[PDB]
């Protein structure tokens, strides 16, 4: 039919089937259902499949990219459309241990990562001298070489963005408690989790509410399910700045 005509129809079957809210159905389940309809339509040989195993494919924790929702409404609406759905902000941002896991690949320039880090650090921290419970976001990167990761870490320190990684000196073992003190440290801007092994040891040392914001392009890491997560898939790393 028309573009508008089937828009109110297609979300109606998914709404009562899973019994979730509007953004958990129209934005979370209906968006993923459009790709895997197209993923088998563009298959060269097996075009028609049985949909018995389709209803559990799209109920993953992830929120996949929709290229047709990129091409129609453009990048201004779509990144705003993703921002308003899962990253609903409040006036008073509570001191929660927020983890920002971003996929790092060699096609990404080192300059645009810092502007994403500067956006995450400014929007998700309150390092004021007057607050009694200061908070600072956690940053995790994956998929890249350690040589490219250290160049990003070394560049941020020269621009007076002081961070901690659980490695306070050369040859140190991983100290998870340094990130907890850095969470309450007003002179530490954010925390830089080195890898996935340093990630899961950090959740065991934090007792306050923890949120995980995952922003990948191709590969998404397996996160524990009880943690509140937002796994948004994007085209490029520069799009992550306009959603956080």
């Amino acid at each position: 039919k028309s573009f508008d005509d089937q828009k109110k129809e297609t979300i109606q079957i998914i709404k009562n089937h899973f019994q979730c809210e509007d953004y958990e159905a129209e934005h979370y389940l209906y968006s993923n259902a459009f790709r895997k309809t197209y993923d088998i339509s563009c298959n060269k040989k097996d075009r028609r499949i049985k949909k018995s195993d389709f209803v559990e494919s799209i109920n993953k924790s992830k929120v996949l990219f929709n290229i047709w929702f990129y091409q129609y409404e453009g990048r201004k609406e779509y990144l705003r459309k993703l921002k308003e759905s899962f990253i609903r902000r409040s006036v008073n941002t509570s001191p929660y241990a927020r983890f920002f896991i971003l996929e790092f690949q060699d096609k990404t320039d080192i300059k645009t990562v810092k502007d994403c880090i500067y956006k995450i650090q400014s929007n998700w921290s309150n390092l004021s001298k007057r607050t009694d419970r200061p908070y600072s976001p956690f940053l995790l990167f994956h998929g890249t070489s350690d040589a490219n990761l250290y160049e990003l870490k070394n560049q941020l320190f020269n621009e007076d963005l002081i961070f901690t990684d659980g490695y306070p000196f050369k040859g140190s073992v991983f100290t998870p408690k340094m990130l907890i003190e850095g969470f309450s440290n007003k002179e530490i801007h954010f925390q830089f989790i080195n890898d996935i092994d340093d990630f899961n040891e950090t959740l065991n040392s934090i007792n306050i509410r923890k949120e995980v914001y995952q922003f990948y392009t191709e590969n998404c890491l397996d996160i524990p399910s009880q943690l509140p997560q937002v796994n948004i898939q994007v085209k490029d790393f520069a799009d992550i700045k306009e959603i956080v």
């Binding site: 006036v91 008073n92 929007n123 309150n126 004021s128």
Partner: protein, 567 residues
């Protein structure tokens, strides 16, 4: 960080902002003044908006500069959309920035629909923020524009009507359906609307017979020296004159009264009273007369034939009103032949029709214009309230009869009329004297019932405290310029729908062009800068010092006397 401000205290409706660095040294001048808007948030998405009420910059010899800003929240912005009713708790501390251009627009833009936006002013603290009002709500609910002399109140009035005339939908070249009437007593709007129908005394033709019984009993009549038997002959002459000059069916002829505006001849009314002054009764006390067509008896049917000059009385003794009406023939003749009353009592008012009068008043004649200018500067002040009330009643029952045909025709096309009352305290004052009792209820009828019938009014005055509160409070939109008289300030603040922060100090502090709009059409009561009007209202006033400085003029004086004697 050019600006580093932070909340240190939170009240239910007050915030304490502590500016810590202030590196820019220009942000404080434009964006941290009183009335400016702040951005209270810890994130870029959702932000409290607070307007600055009062600040204090204490500086000491040894300690730090303590820049303290006291602001009150007005609402909430959630990803570009502004929500009013600011009471959401912002737990301190919080980063405070000046609001950028997009949020301050969103305070005023999104509350009013795109289609019905009427913009004639921008924000005073930030001229890039245009401040719209609900254009439907602006005019059908009455406007009261108030502000002392030297503030440019008439510039604000002229800018709105210029914006109203230029407001049109796409599909035609020009001359939209705006119908605005201005009672210009200072002749200010002569050169503000060049495409208009200006009506001064020399060109206006107001018929005297459209006045009701009260206006006839104040124009023609003295105030206190009038007797009861001499009042009565005024009504009997006028009421019976209106019956003969009627051409309709006798059914409406029976409903013709003294307070019924139908046509009558004022020269014949004088001729009746001049005759009745000379009446002579016989022994049976019946007044016998004589015309060229024969003698008769003066009764209720032959009273119509005393209207001619060549009617000769006969009898023995003095009549009932013999010598008691000679005061009246002189007073009536002093007004018909008064050349300053030619526009109301001349020969043109007799030959004019009822439709031609209303074509003149709303510019529906041969020269059609959106704005009709009634230059009442040359109108005498004793008859000014009579002519204002005559036109105000004529325009009101135009709109009253405009939607008595909607009952039968049922067509969406209509004529909505705005009446601009410059110096509205002059026609509708607070004081209940009889000399202003003509123009009070004509304005008041438009004030109460005029929203229903599509005839609403604009009240423009530099002295608002003398306007009656039975008319000023019927206005729902209030545009307030610089008001410096404390009697005018206390009158306005009591009748305003809202209050913007501290207002007692602010009202004398308004500049030229700075105005305060507050009412139903606007979203929040805001401080605006009215648009500079390219074609400004200016009255031709005699520059006394310029004319006094030059040489003693002696050629003019003999010309003036020969004009006075018409030689």
């Amino acid at each position: 960080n050019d600006i580093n401000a932070e909340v240190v205290s939170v009240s239910p409706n007050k915030l304490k902002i502590s500016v810590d660095d202030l590196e820019e040294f220009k942000i404080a001048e434009e964006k941290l003044g009183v009335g400016s808007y702040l951005r209270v948030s810890d994130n870029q998405d959702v932000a409290l908006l607070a307007i600055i009420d009062n600040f204090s910059i204490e500086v000491k010899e040894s300690q730090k500069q303590k820049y303290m800003i006291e602001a009150s929240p007005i609402g909430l912005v959630k990803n570009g959309k502004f929500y009013r009713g600011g009471d959401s708790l912002a737990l301190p501390p919080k980063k405070v920035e000046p609001a950028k251009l997009d949020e301050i627009i969103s305070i005023y833009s999104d509350s009013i629909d795109i289609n019905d936006r009427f913009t004639f002013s921008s924000l005073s603290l930030n001229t890039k923020v245009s401040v719209p009002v609900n254009g439907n709500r602006f005019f059908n609910k009455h406007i009261a524009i108030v502000g002392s002399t030297g503030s440019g109140k008439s510039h604000t009035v002229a800018k709105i009507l210029q914006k109203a005339v230029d407001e049109k939908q796409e599909g035609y070249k020009g001359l939209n359906n705006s119908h605005i009437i201005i009672f210009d007593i200072h002749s200010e709007y002569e050169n503000a609307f060049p495409n208009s129908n200006v009506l001064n005394v020399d060109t206006l033709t107001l018929p005297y017979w459209l006045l009701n019984g009260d206006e006839l009993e104040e124009l023609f009549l003295d105030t206190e020296a009038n007797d009861h038997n001499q009042r009565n002959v005024f009504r009997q002459a006028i009421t019976l004159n209106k019956k003969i000059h009627f051409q309709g069916d006798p059914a409406t002829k029976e409903i013709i009264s003294f307070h019924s505006p139908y046509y009558f001849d004022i020269n014949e009314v004088i001729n009746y009273i001049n005759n009745r002054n000379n009446e002579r009764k016989n022994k049976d006390n019946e007044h016998i007369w004589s015309d060229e067509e024969g003698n008769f008896k003066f009764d209720n049917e032959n009273a119509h034939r005393l209207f001619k000059e060549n009617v000769t009385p006969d009898g023995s003794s003095a009549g009932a009103l013999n010598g008691k009406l000679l005061n009246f023939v002189d007073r009536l003749q002093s007004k018909i032949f008064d050349k300053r009353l030619d526009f109301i009592l001349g020969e043109g008012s007799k030959s004019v029709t009822f439709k031609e009068t209303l074509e003149t008043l709303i510019s529906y004649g041969k020269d059609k214009s959106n704005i009709t200018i009634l230059d009442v500067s040359g109108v005498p002040f004793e008859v000014l309230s009579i002519c204002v009330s005559l036109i105000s009643r004529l325009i009101f029952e135009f709109g009253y009869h405009s939607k008595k045909i909607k009952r039968k025709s049922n067509e969406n096309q209509d004529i909505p009329i705005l009446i601009v009352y410059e110096e509205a305290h002059k026609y509708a004052p607070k004081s209940d004297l009889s000399k202003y009792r003509t123009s009070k209820e004509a304005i008041e009828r438009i004030a109460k019932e005029g929203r229903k019938y599509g005839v609403t009014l604009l009240l423009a005055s530099q002295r608002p405290s003398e306007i009656s509160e039975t008319i000023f409070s019927q206005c729902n939109t209030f545009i307030s310029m610089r008001l410096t008289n404390p009697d005018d300030q206390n009158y306005v603040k009591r009748l305003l729908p809202d209050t913007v922060g501290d207002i007692t100090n602010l009202l004398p502090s308004l500049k030229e062009g700075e105005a305060l709009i507050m009412g139903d059409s606007i979203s929040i009561p805001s401080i605006v800068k009215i648009e500079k009007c390219t074609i400004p209202p200016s009255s031709i006033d005699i520059k006394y010092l310029d004319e006094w400085r030059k040489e003693w003029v002696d050629s003019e004086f003999d010309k003036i006397i020969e004009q006075w004697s018409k030689s």
